[PDB]
Structures are given as C-alpha cells and as structure tokens.
C-alpha cells in the first residue's frame, strides 16, 4: 500500500501569487504521479501526468516536478479559476490519492455580522427548540462560535454549516444551530452565542433570555 501525503492542506493566496504544493509517497513511485484539480460540485480534472507532462488545454502556468518520493505542483501566477482543491495520485501500484490541498482566495479582512434567532413558538410547542447564530459575509473563514447557557459552555447538539467562498466578494457566511428539547430549554434562562474573529477587536456576544422573546 502506497500512501500519498500532501502539504499544505489549506492555502490562502491572492491572485497573481506563486503557489507550490508538495506531495510525498510512502515509497518510490518513480515518475508515475498525476495531479488533479477539483472544484466544488465538479469532478476532478487531470492537469499533469507522469509528474511533469501538462495535459492538453491546461495553461502553461501549471508545472510539476519530482521523482521517486518527493513531487511538487507549481502555479506560477494564480488565476481566479485556479482556486480549487488539488489532489496528487500515484499509478504504479493500484491508484491512491493524497488528501487534497485547498487553495482559497485571500482578500481583505472582513468582520462578521452576528445575528441570533430564538426558537419559534411553533417549534417550541412541538417539544424542540432550535437556536440559530448567524455570521454573515466575513473573511477569513476561521470564525469560532460557542454557545454559552448561563455562561456555561455547550458540547454536542451543536452543528455548524458554512457556505462556499462567495464568487462576488470572496466572503464566507456561517450558521450554528443549537437543538435542545423544550424540557432542557426551560431549565435555563440566558442563551448566548459568542463569536471570535480577526475582524472583531473584541469577542461579540449576542444573547436573549428565555421568555424575553
């Protein structure tokens, strides 16, 4: 079994930057290495074959190098269409892939707008209370969200969902949903979601006391 490992796992670069992705094989694969590009909702597309040979139609700004165990994929000047996830693949013993390298668009820091939505009266009657914390149009992607109930943190029953990077302004948006039964909901009073991000000088807390809404 030949295992392919890539580095970096995620990279943030601006248009026109030179980017280099490295791939390492557990044993020598000579030059039987291929590089693929994959965009969200789309199939992988072959860019480079046998380590160095560019496929037809692939722009010359892509190049690959290496032999044996160490291989590199280079994009000389990033284009908006090049922001995607890139996989390496060995084809000497079966076909195994690296874990992928996501290249995301670097833009100016944008602080998130924070909104909290208390559960509806309709849902509370059904014995379920879903609290939603919304972070809108922010960059970078790594905003942190914590649910504090009476200044006590919560674990489990909290799922996050984040949009793809917006095509127009390269921002992200994120929602965190805390689902708890009405019985556990009535047990406490203060429900809050605290947000931390580089765009914010200090942590932002949006809260509501149960019964206030």
């Amino acid at each position: 079994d030949i295992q392919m490992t890539q580095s970096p796992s995620t990279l943030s670069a601006s248009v026109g930057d030179r980017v280099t992705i490295t791939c390492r094989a557990s044993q020598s694969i000579a030059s039987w290495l291929a590089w693929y590009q994959q965009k969200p909702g789309k199939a992988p597309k072959l860019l480079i074959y046998k380590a160095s040979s560019l496929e037809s139609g692939v722009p010359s700004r892509f190049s690959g190098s290496g032999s044996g165990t160490e291989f590199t994929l280079t994009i000389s000047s990033l284009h908006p269409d090049d922001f995607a996830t890139y996989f390496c693949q060995q084809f000497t013993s079966y076909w195994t892939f690296g874990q992928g390298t996501k290249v995301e668009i670097k833009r100016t820091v944008a602080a998130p707008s924070v909104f909290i939505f208390p559960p509806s009266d309709e849902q509370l009657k059904s014995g379920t209370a879903s609290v939603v914390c919304l972070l809108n149009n922010f960059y970078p992607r790594e905003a942190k969200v914590q649910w504090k109930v009476d200044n006590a943190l919560q674990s489990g029953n909290s799922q996050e969902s984040v949009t793809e990077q917006d095509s127009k302004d390269s921002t992200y948006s994120l929602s965190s949903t805390l689902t708890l039964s009405k019985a556990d909901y009535e047990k406490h009073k203060v429900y809050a979601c605290e947000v931390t991000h580089q765009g914010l000088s200090s942590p932002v807390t949006k809260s509501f006391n149960r019964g206030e809404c």
């Binding site: 707008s113 208390p118 919304l134 809404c213």
Partner: peptide, 24 residues
C-alpha cells in the same frame, strides 16, 4: 418543517436586519 427565523433587536446590525427560514 419550515420554522421562521424572526427578525428582532438581536438580529439587527446597523441599519440591516437578518431574517430567515429554518427547514428542519
């Protein structure tokens, strides 16, 4: 089950308000 995410003082930022629908 579509539940409303109601606009309120806690879903406002500046002159902008957020609202929505939870599809559960």
């Amino acid at each position: 089950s579509v539940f409303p995410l109601a606009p309120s003082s806690k879903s406002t930022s500046g002159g902008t308000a957020a609202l929505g629908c939870l599809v559960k």
